[PDB]
Design an enzyme around this catalytic site. Sequence first.
Site, PDB file in Angstrom:
ATOM      1  N   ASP A   7      97.384  57.459  38.017  1.00  0.00           N
ATOM      2  CA  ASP A   7      96.966  57.164  36.652  1.00  0.00           C
ATOM      3  C   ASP A   7      95.818  58.095  36.316  1.00  0.00           C
ATOM      4  OD1 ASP A   7      95.855  56.205  34.249  1.00  0.00           O
ATOM      5  OD2 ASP A   7      95.463  54.193  34.987  1.00  0.00           O
ATOM      6  N   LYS A  69      89.641  64.202  29.741  1.00  0.00           N
ATOM      7  CA  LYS A  69      91.001  64.027  29.239  1.00  0.00           C
ATOM      8  C   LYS A  69      91.149  64.340  27.746  1.00  0.00           C
ATOM      9  CE  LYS A  69      94.912  61.046  29.645  1.00  0.00           C
ATOM     10  NZ  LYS A  69      95.253  59.754  30.271  1.00  0.00           N
ATOM     11  N   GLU A 170     102.129  57.822  30.257  1.00  0.00           N
ATOM     12  CA  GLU A 170     101.350  56.636  30.636  1.00  0.00           C
ATOM     13  C   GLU A 170     101.844  55.286  30.107  1.00  0.00           C
ATOM     14  OE1 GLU A 170      97.590  58.058  29.487  1.00  0.00           O
ATOM     15  OE2 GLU A 170      97.372  59.399  31.214  1.00  0.00           O
ATOM     16  N   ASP A 193      99.338  50.848  24.080  1.00  0.00           N
ATOM     17  CA  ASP A 193      98.459  51.560  24.994  1.00  0.00           C
ATOM     18  C   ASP A 193      97.233  51.983  24.197  1.00  0.00           C
ATOM     19  OD1 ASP A 193      97.281  53.047  26.943  1.00  0.00           O
ATOM     20  OD2 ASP A 193      99.069  54.219  27.426  1.00  0.00           O
TER      21      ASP A 193
END
Length: 541
Positions: A7, A69, A170, A193
């Site tokens: 992850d 990220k 993801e 998400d």
Amino acid sequence: GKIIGIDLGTTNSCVAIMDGTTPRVLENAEGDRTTPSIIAYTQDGETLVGQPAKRQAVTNPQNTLFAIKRLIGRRFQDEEVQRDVSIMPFKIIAADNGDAWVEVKGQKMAPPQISAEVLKKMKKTAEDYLGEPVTEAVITVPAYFNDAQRQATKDAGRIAGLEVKRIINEPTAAALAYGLDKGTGNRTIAVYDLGGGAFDISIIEIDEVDGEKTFEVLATNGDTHLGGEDFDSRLINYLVEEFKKDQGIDLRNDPLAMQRLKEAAEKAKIELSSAQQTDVNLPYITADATGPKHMNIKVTRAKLESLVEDLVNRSIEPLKVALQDAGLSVSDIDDVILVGGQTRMPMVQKKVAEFFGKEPRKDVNPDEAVAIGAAVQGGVLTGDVKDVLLLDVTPLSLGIETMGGVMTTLIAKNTTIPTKHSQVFSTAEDNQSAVTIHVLQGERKRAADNKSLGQFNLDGINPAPRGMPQIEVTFDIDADGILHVSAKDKNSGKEQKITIKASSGLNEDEIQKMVRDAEANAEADRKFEELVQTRRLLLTG
Ligand SMILES: Nc1ncnc2c1ncn2[C@@H]1O[C@H](COP(=O)(O)OP(=O)(O)OP(=O)(O)O)[C@@H](O)[C@H]1O
């Protein structure tokens, strides 16, 4: 042999493994099942990553990297980066090719080398637990990631020394954890998400046929202005005004104060999913001409719910969009799954409970769910999990406009993505100098009967008496579901190409009306194409 799932979170990373039939989340070196995604550069020349890097940020804003990220794979002139350049306390620079890079202590470095460090920690976390080297990996990415970002995720692993066996997105990874529980077949699920960096909603079908469990994404879309880091901003701005009202100091211009304040803001936020009160005591946060200043203000919970309700409401139109793209009613939606640490806050679950009329499933770990599911993919690849199929297929055929206003099928419905196939076409006119490639999708044989998705020209075709130049057309739908159309004239060497995005949803109710229409209209479709053959397939101007 075995393939690990990672992850890759904006805020926290998590490592898990299949231990036979049941998954196990593995602890990092501190004993924590999650590791903060923060990178720090100390005066002594070593680089801190994870919990050690998080801790020295308040005194080292330029050389402590976090939220990396948000930087991977993007161009500098993007609005949010300019938005990002102003708010971030460390140095943001442009690469020679125009890419967004960072520079720390005079060294110009790209994000993938930085993110590789966390994987090595995750790698070493895995290597210490396993006592052997590990090299095969499945890595996760956001569902809204484009073509450039996923390949860059593969490369970052290689800088960390990893063979990237699979990229998966993801929202899909977290769902694999849920399907280990009993009774998960033949259901429609929604993957909502909401991370630190963005909002994402995905619609996923969990089907099970003939002992095989199949999973297909029905819709996805994202909104980068609704992520968890945008929530923290909604507090940094307010907190300065209460001190300014009482004592006249504007903190927005003080990074060192901003560095402790974000930490005070971030750690307390976790507390309010469990707690109702707390006092922030950060002595010696700044000073002015009359001496030191001290923070001491009591504040509860309601004000925050008033402050961030619009973010939940602005995420609703993306939720509303997701249902239309999947063609489903709420009555077809069977289950709710919470993923992500921020769902532990009660009002979001209630805002969700009001919307769905049912409690979200309480058996999914919000800090670990994404990591657990990625580990399952490794067991499928090693054969450790039986009778499971990843389903990613096209709902409708794709093609180009050909002679006579005809659609020539290049990709038949229900072929697994990614995919690539080649076919030869030619020129229609003497000494033809140009062609039009009109990219088309649908089940009808008349080109004039399909939707325009875009079109493009290829030039440099050599003059000839008609049909001699050889123009090869390539359609590539890559693992992101994004269609790449490329053309190279083999006699001259020239190359041109286009990219066609993955669909945000698959609307089967309207698709199924069109398919049944096509079975009823099969004979009408043949005579037109055969009489165009009557009047190598050809492309118009
Ligand atoms: N106990 C908690 N209560 C409230 N919020 C939390 C808690 N734990 C973590 N968070 C928040 O959740 C966010 C991180 O969630 P997660 O680790 O699933 O994100 P990510 O995968 O890093 O993000 P993205 O999918 O955008 O890359 C951060 O904003 C963090 O502040």
